[PDB]
Design a protein around this ligand. Structure first.
Ligand SMILES: [Mg+2]
Ligand SMILES: [Zn+2]
Ligand SMILES: [Zn+2]
Lengths: 108, 1266, 87
DNA sequence: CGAACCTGGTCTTGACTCCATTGCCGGATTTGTATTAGACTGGCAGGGTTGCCCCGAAGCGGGCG
DNA sequence: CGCCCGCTTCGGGGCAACCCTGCTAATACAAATCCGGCAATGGAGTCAAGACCAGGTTCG
């Protein structure tokens, strides 16, 4: 009849030692729209330049050590869906067709 | 301002939240609709359980597992991105969602009234077309640009309009030419004429089509031009084709949007203060419904104006996220997961947000965009309050999903379920059994139950004794029960009080504190004298045991809730430890006097002496243990240890007949001598036959004269003697002792022939069905009383059945009559009487049909009892809802106003007969005025407790009217003062400065509703407190003069001639169901009536007698009216409880004229606040508002509360909470309701600051001596 | 809640720490410091043989010998009946 | 009282030995994305039920010109 | 003797709450992720002897 469950999280029991801790660093991260966030890192820790801040947008490191900006590609354009299946000469034929069309529409 | 909440609370300010504050609260943006992996069962990044955002689940262990120590704390590992900490910050930390599109909060749109609708002054049924993307709305316009361009613009409008004219000119010309061609092709040939006319008709209908097509185009152009000229903000373009063909022209002159961003823009280009002054001018100059609507708008407009709020926060941009432990996904055994039904709504919101965001980043056509925006809006609406608009979103099998607002509202709402109760540790329950040998301040207790209750205590004590190395082997020994642990359990239970409670808790004595003691068995032994307080018969009713822990808790249990300290009623001062069912019969047998008995005194002396006296009661005991003396025989003892009565005592010894030394004789029985041995030494001899009423008077006398601990011992000794002589009383029931009256049968013959004549006359048809039924009812009631009379005279007094009744232990005479004799009338299931009736007794045995008739009333009574106890619980709820904030805070308000009491009116001869309802009214009161005896001395000075002897002195002095204080005239602002409350009904002394008299009054009124056996009952009481219009609504007078009395066609047409020159007040709608009031004789046409004389019989509304004869008269009326019902059920309630309740009704006043200081007419404000602001405002703004005293109902008084948290749990919790946030009304935490909810030490009893801050030190002399 | 605080285990672990400190203080100062720095019982971090021989200015071997001797000294049922009851 | 001697440990030294700890490559599986060419172009539980309040409209009366 | 609006009342509609009632199928491919097995170790521990005497114990 009795039923139990478990929140999947460890419950450890030590004392809240306020005095003796691992010493730590503080790194200032800045987002795009002039927002400052200071993140407590450890001493023995490399400080990453890029960061997802408390703001939720991307926040960079306040010293300009220049992480790599994009190094990526655009996914696929509608131009790419067109160009992978058509000819540029064909598109030129359609363009000159529509140009002569707006010609015949506009001045006679 | 303290979010870590360290114990110095004073206020609780609710406020509307800005989106800036929302993103200030959050520790990250959730942006993926994920919960947890299916496979590794760890939470996902950017999800609804994201440990980067919400926090770690493992105490001081990060997600990537780089750091796993508590020494690593307050750092964030660069890989996992998690602040390593304790894993209960996931209870506190919130997340947020930055939206792509604005959203309106639903509580400002779909309530009553619409807050957005008043703030914008638009129709809600048109605002819904705005925010749900059904209508565009102009949010701004450049008026001066149109104003200086508009002549040129209407010139090009004429150019536009002239083009359609040229079009129809060309079309009508070409069509006229084509019809001329049709005429030339019809007239050049030979044919039938009608076909040519139809070709003509075709041409004409074509040019008809031309001309009205042109006309319609011109209509469209003039309409769109009229719209452009009359263009203004807050204008709605419904059906959107006008908008779509409109904007392309002149779009540089206006902005018109659709949906929530348009609402945002309208709030942005908005002054509150210009429209504030505009509404002030309108209420300055308006009239009627226009100014009423202006007031209703000015309410919320000045609400936004006065506070530091902003209506910008009414629309929403960032949606917060509740911490995930409040909505957890706990697994069960086997991976069956248990979500919390909010996660589905959050997933809908995240999915629709990301879909909208991808649509915007792609570039999408308009319909899909507005569709996704409306879906997002409805998703946030379902997130906040599912089912508020349209159709509730359901899950599996069409069960609607619990929204976020559903946590607070309804049955399972957070406020009410917190207010309902909490299951507690250190408690237990069992079935109870009688404990008749035990002391009053005790309770027996099952040892295996107390072994579990007191387990940390016994573990500590057998750690102190060297029986275990630690607490762990101590706990194991407690499980293994090594028999020294019972001795240690005795030691720890010694002097440690426990609580006891029978559910339900009807009143204050439902919880009492007893000293436990370890008893064999497994049931809770209850002392028998508290069964009346608990209403606990031993038919299997269980009781719940609690246990105090702190020293303060042990003190409160030991001193307040102890058995010996709570003896009297809190309601009406009479005791509840009083002897009862068995021991009353025991003592009645023990003290009754029986002449014609063995060893009875005779004074007659032949050769013998009188041979009846006995020198000592010890000698009497010896001669009674030998079989000479019966106990109930009359003798003449010589007493040396008992106090003689006042006649004999004053006769012999004058100054003091002091029983420790004196010796005196009396003619009594042995039993009464042994009885007065139980009573204390100072008490005089009684020498009466102990009826229950006599014993009640005795115990009242003891409690009013002697200290309480004496009375507890006396009642215990009475219990022992009552049981010991209930044994020997010989009261048994044999069916040979249920004697029948012998001439019952001829009485049945008599009334049977009478009923036979009546029914035969009905069979003649001379009288109808109703009159013969009523005649049968009256004849059989006469026969019933005849049989009961014959039964009553037939029984001898030693018949045990009549002995129990005449003693007053239990049962009325009617139950004895229905045992032996005749049941009589059994009811209709409707409520009428069955005219048969039952002619037999239970000893005779009924018939099939008679028993079948009896079933109706039996089952109706059971169902009525269930309904009564439920509704009495509800009425007790409402009374606690009203009176929860009335405590004593001062000793004396020192007014001199106060009510008068009738107080033992005289005769027409002048003989002061005692008024029967003095004990409920005049006692336990303090005289605010003096009393003098025909300008003689002051008999009773100002402010005396008004108990029995001084009231007897007032009856001696012959005065009947005293101006006495009341809580109706207490002059304290915050509650009552003590002297106007008088004697506390249970202590017997003056009330303290911390008593919650409101809750005591509420329980004292609400308790006998079960005994209220029934419009003349509990709904009558309820509508009296709800102050509704009565069903027995009968008119009262307005001024003196004789009546214009008349009973016209089929109902009544009664008017009143005024004594002064005035109008006749016309009373039209009086049905013939009402009857003429009998008063002073029966009312007649031309009776000079009073001002408060009731015209008909019945019950007037109290509103009318308030409006005519003010507050004093309606108070005097309501007390008498409710007390009359409690008289009718034979339940004595002291009147000060009803005084407390009615005082809460008459707190607030209405406004009919505003004065000049922020007053709306018809507003209900407190009287004292009103009078104080008037005495401030008479200087510099001296327009006193015209206030009128108003009587508001108990629910209405509850809803007109002080704080939002004080209400919070009654009725439309949402509507309370929304304008609570709008007003930004801060709480001050002055009631006890809120301090209970937040768990603060409440300001009552032990809780106020006078007792909370007591400095404790020893006396310095004893400090030095020790 | 199977992952909730049993609340007798907390005070039992407290008493464990308390009498543990008592039994560790029954011995000499260097030995108790060795055991505390070895098992991290004074800070939470188990400092190894190099750190203990650093803080006492001695070899790893001497720390190993001292720790083995402390294990010999702890292994008395007289010393450890209360400790045996703790598990 | 001085030389002989076993044992308090105390600590060094080398020498060895086991073992995680990256690291690297190679393979396995696992998740995410794109792509399928005959035509095939607008549905549905809600449903009710009570009750109470609120506004709109109707009806009428009453004070005015 | 008519006018005009304001008061009053009925009536319907909307809203809060609550229960009843219902209650097509792959492929191609890349990219990521995992995991499996030697191979750099250097570090962390571990036998074993040996040298430091210092102080009680033995014989003279
Ligand atoms: Mg019972
Ligand atoms: Zn981590
Ligand atoms: Zn007072």
């Amino acid at each position: 009849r009795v039923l139990r469950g478990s929140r999947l999280g460890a419950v450890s029991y030590e004392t809240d030692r306020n005095h003796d801790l691992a010493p730590r660093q503080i790194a200032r991260y800045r987002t795009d729209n002039g927002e400052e966030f200071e993140v407590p890192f450890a001493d023995d820790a490399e400080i990453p330049g890029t960061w997802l801040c408390r703001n939720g947008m991307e926040g960079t490191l306040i010293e300009g050590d220049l992480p790599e900006p994009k190094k990526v590609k655009p996914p696929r354009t509608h131009w790419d869906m067109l160009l992978e299946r058509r000819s540029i000469e064909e598109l030129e034929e359609l363009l000159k067709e529509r140009l002569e069309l707006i010609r015949s529409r506009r001045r006679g | 301002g303290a979010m870590l909440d360290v114990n110095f609370f004073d206020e609780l300010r609710i406020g509307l939240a800005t989106a800036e504050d929302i993103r200030q609260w959050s520790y990250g943006e959730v942006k993926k609709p994920e919960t947890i992996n299916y496979r590794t069962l760890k939470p996902e990044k950017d999800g609804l359980f994201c440990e980067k955002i919400f926090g770690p689940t493992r105490d001081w262990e990060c997600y990537c597992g780089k750091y796993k120590r508590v020494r690593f704390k307050g750092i964030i590992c660069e890989r996992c991105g998690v602040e390593v900490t304790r894993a209960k910050v996931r209870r506190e930390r919130m997340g947020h969602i930055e939206l792509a599109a604005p959203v309106t909060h639903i509580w400002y749109f779909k309530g009553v009234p619409s807050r957005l609708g008043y703030l914008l002054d638009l129709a809600p049924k048109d605002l819904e077309k705005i925010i749900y993307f059904a209508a565009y709305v102009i949010t701004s316009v450049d008026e001066e640009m149109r104003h200086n361009e508009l002549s040129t613009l209407e010139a090009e409008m004429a150019v536009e309009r002239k083009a359609v004219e040229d079009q129809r000119d060309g079309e009508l010309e070409a069509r006229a030419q084509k019809l001329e061609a049709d005429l030339a092709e019809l007239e050049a040939e030979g044919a039938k004429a009608d076909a040519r006319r139809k070709v003509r008709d075709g041409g004409e209908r074509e040019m008809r089509q031309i001309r009205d097509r042109a006309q319609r185009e011109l209509d469209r152009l003039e309409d769109i031009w009229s719209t452009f000229t009359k263009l203004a903000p807050k204008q709605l373009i419904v059906d959107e084709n006008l908008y779509r063909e409109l904007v392309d022209r002149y779009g540089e002159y206006f902005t018109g949007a659709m949906g929530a961003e348009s609402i945002q823009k309208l709030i942005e280009n908005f002054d509150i203060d210009a429209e504030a002054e505009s509404l002030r001018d309108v209420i300055r100059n308006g009239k009627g419904q226009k100014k009423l609507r202006a007031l209703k708008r000015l309410k919320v407009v000045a609400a936004f104006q006065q506070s530091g709020n902003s209506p910008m926060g009414m629309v929403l941009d960032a949606v917060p996220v509740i911490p995930p432990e409040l909505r957890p996904m706990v697994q069960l055994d086997g991976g069956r997961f248990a979500t919390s039904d909010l996660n589905d709504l959050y997933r809908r919101v995240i999915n629709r947000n990301n879909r909208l965001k991808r649509l915007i980043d792609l570039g999408a056509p308009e319909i899909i965009v507005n569709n996704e925006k409306r879906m997002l809006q409805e998703s946030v609406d379902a997130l906040f309050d599912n089912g508020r608009r349209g159709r509730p979103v359901t899950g599996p099998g069409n069960r609607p999903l619990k929204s976020l607002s559903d946590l607070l509202k309804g049955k399972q709402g957070r406020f009410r379920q917190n207010l309902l109760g909490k299951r507690v540790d250190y408690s237990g329950r069992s079935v109870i059994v009688v404990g008749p040998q035990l002391k009053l301040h005790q309770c027996g207790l099952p040892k295996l139950m107390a072994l579990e209750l007191f387990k940390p205590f016994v573990m500590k004590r057998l750690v102190d004794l060297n029986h275990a190395q630690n607490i762990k082997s101590a706990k194991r020994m407690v499980e293994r029960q090594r028999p020294q642990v019972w001795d240690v359990l005795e030691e720890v239970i010694a002097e440690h009080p426990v609580l006891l409670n029978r559910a339900p808790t009807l009143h204050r004595l439902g919880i009492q504190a007893f000293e436990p003691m370890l008893v064999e068995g497994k049931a809770i032994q209850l002392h028998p004298l508290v069964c009346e307080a608990f209403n606990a018969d031993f038919d299997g009713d269980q009781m719940a045991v609690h246990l105090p822990l702190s020293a303060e808790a042990q003190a409160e249990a030991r001193i307040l809730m102890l058995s010996s300290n709570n003896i009297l009623s809190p309601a009406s001062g009479r005791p509840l430890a009083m002897p009862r069912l068995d021991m009353v019969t025991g003592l009645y047998y023990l003290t009754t006097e029986v002449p014609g008995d063995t060893g009875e005194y005779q004074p007659a002396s032949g050769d013998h002496p009188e041979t009846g006296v006995y020198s000592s009661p010890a000698e009497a005991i010896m001669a009674a243990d030998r079989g000479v003396l019966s106990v109930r025989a009359k003798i003449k003892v010589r007493l040396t240890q008992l106090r003689p009565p006042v006649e004999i005592e004053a006769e012999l010894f004058g100054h003091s007949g002091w029983q420790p030394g004196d010796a005196w004789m009396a003619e009594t029985t042995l039993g009464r001598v042994m009885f007065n041995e139980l009573l204390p030494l100072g008490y005089p001899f009684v020498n009466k036959q102990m009826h229950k009423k006599v014993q009640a008077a005795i115990i009242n006398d003891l409690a009013e004269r002697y200290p309480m601990i004496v009375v507890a011992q006396t009642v215990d000794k009475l219990k022992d003697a009552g049981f010991y002589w209930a044994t020997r009383s010989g009261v048994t029931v044999s069916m040979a002792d249920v004697l029948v009256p012998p001439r019952k049968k001829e009485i049945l013959d008599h009334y049977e022939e009478r009923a036979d004549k009546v029914e035969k006359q009905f069979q003649r048809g001379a009288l109808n069905h109703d009159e013969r039924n009523e005649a049968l009812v009256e004849i059989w009631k006469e026969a019933t009383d005849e049989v009961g009379q014959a039964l009553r005279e037939h029984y001898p007094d030693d018949n045990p059945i009549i002995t129990i009744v005449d003693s007053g232990a239990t049962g009325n005479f009617t139950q004895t009559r229905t045992l032996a004799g005749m049941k009589g009338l059994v009811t209709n299931p409707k409520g009428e009487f069955i005219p048969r009736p039952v002619k037999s007794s239970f000893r005779e045995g009924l018939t099939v049909l008679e028993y079948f008739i009896n079933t109706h009333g039996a089952r109706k009574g059971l169902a009525d009892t269930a309904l009564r106890t439920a509704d009495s619980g509800y009425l007790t709820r409402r009374l606690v809802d009203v009176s929860q904030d009335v405590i004593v805070r001062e000793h004396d308000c020192q007014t001199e106003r106060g009510i008068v009491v009738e107080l033992a009116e005289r005769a027409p001869d002048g003989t002061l007969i005692r008024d029967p309802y003095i004990e409920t009214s005049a006692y336990a009161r303090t005289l605010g005025t003096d009393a003098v005896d025909e300008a003689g001395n002051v008999i009773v000075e100002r402010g005396q407790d008004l108990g029995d002897p001084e009231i007897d002195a007032l009856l001696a002095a012959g005065i009947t009217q005293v101006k006495v204080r009341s809580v109706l005239t207490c002059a304290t602002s915050t509650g009552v003062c003590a002297t106007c409350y008088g004697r506390s009904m249970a202590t017997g002394k003056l009330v303290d400065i911390g008593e919650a008299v409101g809750i005591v009054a509420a329980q004292s009124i609400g308790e006998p509703g079960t005994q209220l056996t029934m419009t003349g009952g509990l709904p009558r009481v309820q509508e009296l407190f709800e102050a509704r219009v009565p069903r027995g609504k009968a008119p009262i007078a307005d001024v003196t003069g004789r009546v214009r009395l008349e009973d016209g066609e089929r109902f009544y047409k009664i008017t009143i001639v005024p004594d002064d020159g005035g109008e006749e007040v016309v009373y039209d709608k009086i049905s013939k169901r009402q009857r003429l009031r009998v008063f002073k004789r029966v009312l007649s046409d031309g009776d000079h009536v009073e001002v408060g004389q009731q015209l008909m019989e019945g019950s007037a509304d109290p509103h009318e007698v308030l409006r005519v004869q003010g507050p004093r008269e309606v108070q005097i009326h309501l007390v008498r009216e409710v007390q009359e019902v409690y008289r009718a059920q034979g339940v004595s309630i002291h009147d000060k409880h009803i005084e407390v309740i009615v005082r809460q009704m008459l707190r607030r006043v209405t406004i009919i004229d505003s004065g000049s200081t922020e007053f709306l007419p018809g507003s209900l404000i407190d009287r004292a606040e009103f009078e104080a602001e008037n005495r401030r405002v008479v200087a510099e703004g001296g327009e006193p508002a015209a206030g009128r005293p108003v009587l508001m109902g108990i629910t209405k008084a509850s809803l007109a509360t002080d704080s939002w948290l004080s209400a919070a749990s009654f009725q439309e919790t949402t509507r309370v909470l929304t304008d609570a946030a709008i007003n930004c009304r801060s709480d001050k935490l002055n009631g006890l309701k809120e301090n209970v909810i937040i768990g603060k030490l409440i300001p009552a009893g032990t809780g106020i600051n006078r007792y909370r801050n007591i400095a404790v030190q020893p006396t310095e002399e004893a400090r030095a001596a020790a | 809640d199977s992952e909730a605080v049993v609340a007798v285990d907390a005070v039992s672990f407290t008493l464990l720490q308390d009498q543990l400190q008592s039994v560790l203080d029954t011995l000499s100062e260097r030995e108790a410091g060795v055991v505390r720095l070895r098992f991290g019982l004074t800070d939470g971090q188990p400092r190894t043989l190099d750190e203990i021989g650093q803080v006492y200015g001695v070899t790893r071997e001497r720390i190993r010998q001292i720790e083995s001797k402390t294990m010999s000294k702890l292994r008395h049922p007289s010393r450890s009946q209360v400790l045996r009851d703790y598990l």
